[PDB]
Amino acid sequence: SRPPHLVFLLADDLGWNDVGFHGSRIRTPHLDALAAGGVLLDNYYTQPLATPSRSQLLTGRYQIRTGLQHQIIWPCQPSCVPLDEKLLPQLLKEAGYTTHMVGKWHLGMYRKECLPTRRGFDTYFGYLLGSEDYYSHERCTLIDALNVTRCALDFRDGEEVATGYKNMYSTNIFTKRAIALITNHPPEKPLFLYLALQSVHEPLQVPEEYLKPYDFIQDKNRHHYAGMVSLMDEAVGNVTAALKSSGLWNNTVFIFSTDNGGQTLAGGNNWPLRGRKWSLWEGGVRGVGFVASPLLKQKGVKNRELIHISDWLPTLVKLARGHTNGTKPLDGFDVWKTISEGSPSPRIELLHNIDPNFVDSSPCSAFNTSVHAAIRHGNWKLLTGYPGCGYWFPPPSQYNVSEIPSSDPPTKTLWLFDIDRDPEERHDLSREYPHIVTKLLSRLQFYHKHSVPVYFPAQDPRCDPKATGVWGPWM
Numbered sequence: 515s516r517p518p519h520l521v522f523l524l525a526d527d528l529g530w531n532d533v534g535f536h537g538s539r540i541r542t543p544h545l546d547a548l549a550a551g552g553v554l555l556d557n558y559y560t561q562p563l564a565t566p567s568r569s570q571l572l573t574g575r576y577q578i579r580t581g582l583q584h585q586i587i588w589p590c591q592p593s594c595v596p597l598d599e600k601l602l603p604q605l606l607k608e609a610g611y612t613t614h615m616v617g618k619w620h621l622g623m624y625r626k627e628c629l630p631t632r633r634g635f636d637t638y639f640g641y642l643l644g645s646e647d648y649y650s651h652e653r654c655t656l657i658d659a660l661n662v663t664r665c666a667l668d669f670r671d672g673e674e675v676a677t678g679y680k681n682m683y684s685t686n687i688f689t690k691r692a693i694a695l696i697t698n699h700p701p702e703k704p705l706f707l708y709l710a711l712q713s714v715h716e717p718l719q720v721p722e723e724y725l726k727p728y729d730f731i732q733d734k735n736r737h738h739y740a741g742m743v744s745l746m747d748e749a750v751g752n753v754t755a756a757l758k759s760s761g762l763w764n765n766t767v768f769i770f771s772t773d774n775g776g777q778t779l780a781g782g783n784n785w786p787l788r789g790r791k792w793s794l795w796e797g798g799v800r801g802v803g804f805v806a807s808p809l810l811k812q813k814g815v816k817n818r819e820l821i822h823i824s825d826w827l828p829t830l831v832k833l834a835r836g837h838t839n840g841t842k843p844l845d846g847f848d849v850w851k852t853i854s855e856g857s858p859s860p861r862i863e864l865l866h867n868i869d870p871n872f873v874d875s876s877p878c879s880a881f882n883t884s885v886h887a888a889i890r891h892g893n894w895k896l897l898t899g900y901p902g903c904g905y906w907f908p909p910p911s912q913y914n915v916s917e918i919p920s921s922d923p924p925t926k927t928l929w930l931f932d933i934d935r936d937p938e939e940r941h942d943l944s945r946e947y948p949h950i951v952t953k954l955l956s957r958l959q960f961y962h963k964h965s966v967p968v969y970f971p972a973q974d975p976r977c978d979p980k981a982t983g984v985w986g987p988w989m
């Protein structure tokens with residue numbers, strides 16, 4: 515046999531209750547089918563934000579190793595994933611694969627060296643920043659030092675400015691590109707396609723026809739969001755259909771995953787899980803994910819083994835019969851036997867994150883419990899500091915309340931949950947199991963001892979895109 519084609523489709527801001535297979539009122543026919551015929555990842559985790567998840571996805575290493583613990587990489591920040599990190603596509607490339615990427619990058623772009631084309635991907639088409647207009651592909655940000663809001667194009671074909679795509683919805687553009695890559699792929703060479711869609715991140719834009727099926731949803735945001743998810747579902751359908759028509763499917767491993775929990779402020783939903791995007795509650799880190807592939811030993815099963823987004827690197831590299839030589843110490847594991855055969859996971863522990871300067875920007879013992887952090891070990895999860903907005907946000911069309919609060923007093927800074935038996939984080943057990951709290955605090959301090967300093971530089975006004983009307987490198 516030849517190494518399988520590895521296709522990774524990463525959705526943006528897809529919430530736990532935003533797929534039909536989780537009881538969502540949003541219709542996701544294709545995702546449901548693909549999940550039903552494959553392996554549903556029920557104990558799978560990502561990070562609570564964009565840059566965090568994507569950096570861990572491509573480096574297979576925690577943010578405490580890369581200095582990306584705090585928030586994300588904003589447009590004018592002179593920062594990227596450290597240049598000494600070896601990315602997944604580089605390793606797959608050395609395994610004899612043809613690497614392609616389509617979509618959102620968000621891993622740095624202030625220097626040419628930070629670009630996907632200079633980090634492992636043979637070809638690239640998409641946008642560099644974290645968000646933009648679906649149709650114009652433009653992004654506006656406030657350049658502090660100048661006190662002006664600059665709007666500029668952020669679209670690329672290779673390293674060139676991708677002009678002439680105005681008034682064209684990004685998902686259709688990206689799907690068409692991916693399908694062209696699938697159709698025109700020269701057989702005998704393994705394919706690696708990383709499809710990082712804009713869907714379903716805000717702005718809440720969708721072609722008007724996807725709105726009618728959801729007239730029952732009164733909430734404006736969820737109404738528009740539902741249509742966005744449905745369109746994305748259709749796009750996912752086209753991609754898989756193409757892998758089949760092209761005859762690549764029989765030796766393809768298709769992985770679908772969200773990059774973080776839904777943002778209720780932007781129509782997303784995580785019910786019945788607690789929290790949302792930006793927080794370390796389950797609603798922000800436990801994500802929608804599944805593997806669809808004829809290579810799976812067991813199909814049509816819900817896998818409850820502990821997996822994290824950082825596990826994909828060593829997993830795809832092994833599937834690619836390659837080697838992880840060249841990378842710095844990895845924080846993930848090869849979980850293919852776990853996903854395919856359902857065997858005990860190699861991972862029993864997961865550090866969610868440690869951020870000393872965490873702030874909830876969105877509208878809502880050896881270890882210092884005032885520091886925002888969370889760790890999962892076995893069935894237990896410990897959260898310290900301010901985890902983020904801790905309300906449960908029920909689905910709008912089913913509940914006449916926007917949020918449900920907990921009984922936590924304002925001064926609370928420690929939580930212990932048995933996630934296995936209490937996935938909705940309803941009952942704190944910290945006082946009931948003091949020794950487990952102590953154990954996890956020691957682990958938190960262990961990780962803290964092996965962390966690099968947080969690198970969150972101030973804006974560099976020289977990011978100003980006015981001269982060329984396009985966001986891009988400046989250093």
Ligand SMILES: *[C@@H]1O[C@H](CO)[C@@H](O[C@@H]2O[C@H](CO)[C@@H](O)[C@H](O)[C@H]2NC(C)=O)[C@H](O)[C@H]1NC(C)=O
Binds near residue numbers: 685
């Ligand atoms: C998914 O594939 C469908 C079918 O190929 C795409 O819809 C077609 O788009 C063309 C281009 O304007 C139209 O002329 C056809 O009438 C449409 N075909 C069908 C069968 O409806 C769709 O755009 C693809 N992409 C996404 C993101 O859904």
Ligand SMILES: *[C@@H]1O[C@H](CO)[C@@H](O[C@@H]2O[C@H](CO)[C@@H](O)[C@H](O)[C@H]2NC(C)=O)[C@H](O)[C@H]1NC(C)=O
Binds near residue numbers: 870871882884885886
């Ligand atoms: C425990 O953690 C908190 C928050 O991480 C620390 O308090 C902050 O310390 C920084 C460090 O220079 C200040 O700039 C912040 O303004 C402080 N407050 C907050 C809310 O972040 C605290 O000092 C840590 N150490 C101890 C010994 O408690």
Ligand SMILES: [Ca+2]
Binds near residue numbers: 526527563564773774
């Ligand atoms: Ca995101």
Ligand SMILES: [Cl-]
Binds near residue numbers: 562793794867
């Ligand atoms: Cl975090």
